[PDB]
Amino acid sequence: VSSCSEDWVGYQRKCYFISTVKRSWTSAQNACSEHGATLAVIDSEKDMNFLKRYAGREEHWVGLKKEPGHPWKWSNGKEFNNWFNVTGSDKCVFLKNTEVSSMECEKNLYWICNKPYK
Amino acid sequence: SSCSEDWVGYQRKCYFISTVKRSWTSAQNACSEHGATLAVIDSEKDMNFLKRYAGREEHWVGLKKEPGHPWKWSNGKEFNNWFNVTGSDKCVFLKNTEVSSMECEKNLYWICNKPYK
Ligand SMILES: [Cl-]
Ligand SMILES: [Cl-]
Ligand SMILES: [Cl-]
C-alpha cells in the first residue's frame, strides 16, 4: 500500500490534488470532501512555496476562509494565526506563483485539496 | 509508503527540485548521489507535472544529445521525439512555459527523478 494515489502529488506527508476545472470555493470544498480531503491547509513555508510554484499563473482556491465576526479558520477547523499575509478583504483565499489573495467565494477558480499521507 | 523527505511523489516516481544552480553534468552527479537521474519524462502527465513543478526558472532534465548518437533519456530509453527541443544545444531544460536546450556548462537549477515501488 502507498501513501497517496498515483494521480495525487505527495509532499511532506500530505497528498495534494490539483483540479483541472474551475468551480466556486464551496463546490471545490465539496469535491475535496468527496475524496477524504479538504481545500489545501498550509502548515509551513515549505508547503506554501511548493503550492505557489505549482499553482503557476492561475489562481487556485485553498482551505482558508474568513467570516466577519470569526477568526480566520482553516478547512480542518484549525484557527489560522496570520503567519502569511492575504491581500484584499474577500472571504475566500486563493494563491498563485506571485500572490496569496482573496476573491468572492462564488467565483470559479481552479483549486487544490490536501489530506494526510495514508 | 512514499517518497522520502524533501522528495515529491507523482505517477510512481519521486522528484527532487534543486535549490542551487549547477552544470548539467554536476546536476546529473548530484542526482546520482541520491539514487536518481536528471528527470526522465515518460508521459504527457509527467511533462505537465514537471513544467508546473519547475515554475518560472529554467531546470535541467535528463535529456541529452551526443552529436553522433540519437537523443537519449538518462534511464537509457531512446527519445522518440514526441516533443520538440528548440534551441541549439546538447542539454535539455524546461520551465512552466518552455522546453528547450542550453549550453551544458551553464549553471541552471535541476530536477531529479527515480521510480518508486
Ligand atoms: Cl478536477
Ligand atoms: Cl540542491
Ligand atoms: Cl544558485
From Swiss-Prot, chain A:
Q: In which tissues is it expressed?
A: Expressed on the surface of activated T-cells, B-cells, natural killer cells, neutrophils, eosinophils, epidermal Langerhans cells and platelets.
Q: How is it modified after translation?
A: Constitutive Ser/Thr phosphorylation in both mature thymocytes and activated T-lymphocytes.
Give the location in the cell: Cell membrane
Glycosylation site list: N85
Question: Can the keyword Glycoprotein be found in this entry's annotation?
Answer: yes
Q: Name one GO cellular component term.
A: external side of plasma membrane
Where on the tree of life does the source sit, at the highest rank? Eukaryota
Name the Gene Ontology biological process terms.
cellular response to xenobiotic stimulus; negative regulation of T cell migration; negative regulation of T-helper 17 cell lineage commitment
Q: Which residues lie on this side of the membrane: Extracellular?
A: 1-118
Residues in C-type lectin domain copies: 11-114
Query: Could you state a single Gene Ontology molecular function term?
Result: identical protein binding
Q: What is its main location?
A: membrane
Which key words tag this protein in UniProt?
A: Cell membrane, Disulfide bond, Glycoprotein, Lectin, Membrane, Phosphoprotein, Receptor, Signal-anchor, Transmembrane, Transmembrane helix
Which cysteines are disulphide-bonded? C4-C15, C32-C113, C92-C105
What membrane topology does this protein have? Answer: Single-pass type II membrane protein
The conditions that induce or repress this protein are given as: By antigens, mitogens or activators of PKC on the surface of T and B-lymphocytes. By interaction of IL-2 with the p75 IL-2R on the surface of NK cells.
Answer yes or no on keyword Glycoprotein: yes
Q: What function does this protein fulfil?
A: Transmembrane protein expressed mainly on T-cells resident in mucosa that plays an essential role in immune cell homeostasis. Rapidly expressed on the surface of platelets, T-lymphocytes and NK cells upon activation by various stimuli, such as antigen recognition or cytokine signaling, stimulates different signaling pathways in different cell types. Negatively regulates Th17 cell differentiation through its carbohydrate dependent interaction with galectin-1/LGALS1 present on immature dendritic cells.
Summarize the subunit comment: Homodimer; disulfide-linked. Interacts with S100A8 and S100A9. Interacts with galactin-1/LGALS1. Interacts with S1PR1; this interaction mediates S1PR1 degradation.
Its name, as the record gives it, is Early activation antigen CD69
- Organism source for this protein? Homo sapiens (Human)
Q: Which residues of the full protein are shown?
A: 82 to 199 of 199
